[PDB]
C-alpha cells in the first residue's frame, strides 16, 4: 500500500537554472484569441493531457473529463450556445481542436489546477490557447456533448497555432514583490 | 493597447518529443507527506513563484498572494491551528518552507491554475510537497498571518527535499482512455 519514493534531486546550481528557464517559458504564454486553422499533431494533443492528468486531487478523484472536439461541426454549435447565452468569438471555429475539461461531481480546485497543468504543457509544446470558462453555458453543452448529469462544464480552451496575423494587448505582469510576500 | 505576437513555433517532431518528456517529468510528481528540515535555495523559491505569477486571469486581476512562511515558530502556530479545526502533521514543522496561496477577493480558478503551474514548477526544480486545501482553518490564519480582510486562503503547500525514509502510497493513475473523449462524425 505504501512503497518508498523516489526523487531525482539536482545539485542546487542545477535547480536554480531549471527553475530560471521554466519561468522564462512560462512567461511567454499568452492567451490568444486568434488561432490558425492549421491541424495540430494528436499525439501532442494527447500528451498535454496525459500531463493534465498528473494533478493531484482531493481523495485522489482525479475527478476530471477532457472531451477533445473537432468535428467543424460540433465546433460551430458549441459556438452558437455560448453566444447565445447573452442575453442582456471565431477562435471557436478557427481552433483545430477545442478541449472542454468537465469536473465530476474540492474537486473544482483539483480540475482547475489539472487546466493549470494542461496550460503549461501546451506552451511547452508550441500551442497557444485563450482560458476561458463559460458556466453559464455549461447546461446546454453538456447536453449538446452528451456528457452525463454527474459532470459539468468548467474551462473551454481552443487549440491552436497563432495566426500569421495575431496580436496580443500589451500587459504587464505583475512582479515578483508584487505577489510575494515574506514572514519573518 | 495590442501588440503583434510573438511565437517560437518547433517542428511537429520536437513538439511530440517536448510534449512527451514534459509529460514524463511531471508524471513523477507524488505528494509527499514526508520532507526533510534541509534549506533549499531561496532562488527556486521565487522562481517557482515567478512560474506560478505567469497564470491567466479572469479580467486579468492576477489576484493571488503567496505568502512565503519559514520562521520556524510561525510554522508551528500554522500546525496548531489547522489541527485544532478538528472538531468532530508534522511536515508543516520539518518543512523548510510553507507557502500559502491567497486569493484576493473566477477568481478562484485563476488561483487555483497558479496553484497548478506552483505545483509543475516544483516539481521541475527537484523539490516536492503536497497539496492540501485547509478552508476551515482560512480565517484564523488570515488573522495570525496579517493578510487583509480581501484575501481567502485557498492552498497550502509545505516545501522541500522529501525525507530519506520518505513513502508515498501505491496508486495508479487513470489511463489516456479514461479521463480523454473524443468527439467525432
Ligand atoms: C484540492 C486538493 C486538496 C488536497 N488536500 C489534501 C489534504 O488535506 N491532505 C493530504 O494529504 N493530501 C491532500 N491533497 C493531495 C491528494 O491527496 C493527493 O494529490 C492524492 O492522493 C493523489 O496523489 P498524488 O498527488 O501523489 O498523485 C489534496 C489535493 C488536492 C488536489
Ligand atoms: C478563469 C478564467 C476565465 C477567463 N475567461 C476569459 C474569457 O471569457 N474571455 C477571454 O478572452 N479570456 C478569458 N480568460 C483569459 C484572461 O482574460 C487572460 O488570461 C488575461 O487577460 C491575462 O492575459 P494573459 O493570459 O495573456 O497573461 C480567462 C482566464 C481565466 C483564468
Given at each position: 500500500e505504501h512503497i518508498p519514493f523516489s526523487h531525482t534531486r539536482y545539485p542546487e546550481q542545477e535547480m536554480r537554472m531549471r527553475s530560471q528557464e521554466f519561468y522564462e517559458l512560462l512567461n511567454k504564454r499568452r492567451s490568444v484569441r486568434?488561432?490558425?486553422?492549421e491541424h495540430v499533431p494528436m499525439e501532442v494533443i494527447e500528451?498535454?493531457?496525459?500531463?493534465?492528468?498528473?494533478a493531484p486531487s482531493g481523495?485522489?478523484?482525479?475527478?476530471?473529463?477532457?472531451?477533445?472536439?473537432?468535428?467543424?461541426?460540433?465546433?460551430h454549435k458549441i459556438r452558437e450556445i455560448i453566444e447565445e447565452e447573452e442575453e442582456i468569438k471565431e477562435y471557436l471555429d478557427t481552433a483545430p481542436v477545442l478541449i472542454?475539461?468537465?469536473?465530476?461531481?474540492?474537486?473544482?480546485?483539483?480540475?482547475?489546477?489539472?487546466?493549470?497543468?494542461?496550460?503549461?504543457?501546451?506552451?511547452?509544446?508550441?500551442?497557444?490557447?485563450?482560458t476561458t470558462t463559460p458556466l453559464n453555458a455549461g447546461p446546454r453543452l453538456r447536453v449538446l456533448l452528451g456528457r452525463p448529469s454527474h459532470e459539468k462544464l468548467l474551462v473551454l480552451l481552443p487549440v491552436g497555432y497563432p495566426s500569421r496575423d495575431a496580436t496580443v494587448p500589451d500587459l504587464k505582469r505583475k512582479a515578483l514583490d508584487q505577489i510575494m510576500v515574506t514572514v519573518h
Open positions: 486568434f488561432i490558425s486553422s500528451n498535454v493531457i496525459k500531463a493534465a492528468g498528473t481523495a485522489h478523484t482525479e475527478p476530471w473529463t477532457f472531451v477533445v472536439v473537432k468535428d467543424p461541426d460540433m465546433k472542454l475539461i468537465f469536473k465530476q461531481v474540492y474537486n473544482e480546485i483539483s480540475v482547475s489546477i489539472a487546466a493549470g497543468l494542461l496550460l503549461a504543457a501546451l506552451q511547452n509544446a508550441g500551442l497557444v490557447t485563450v
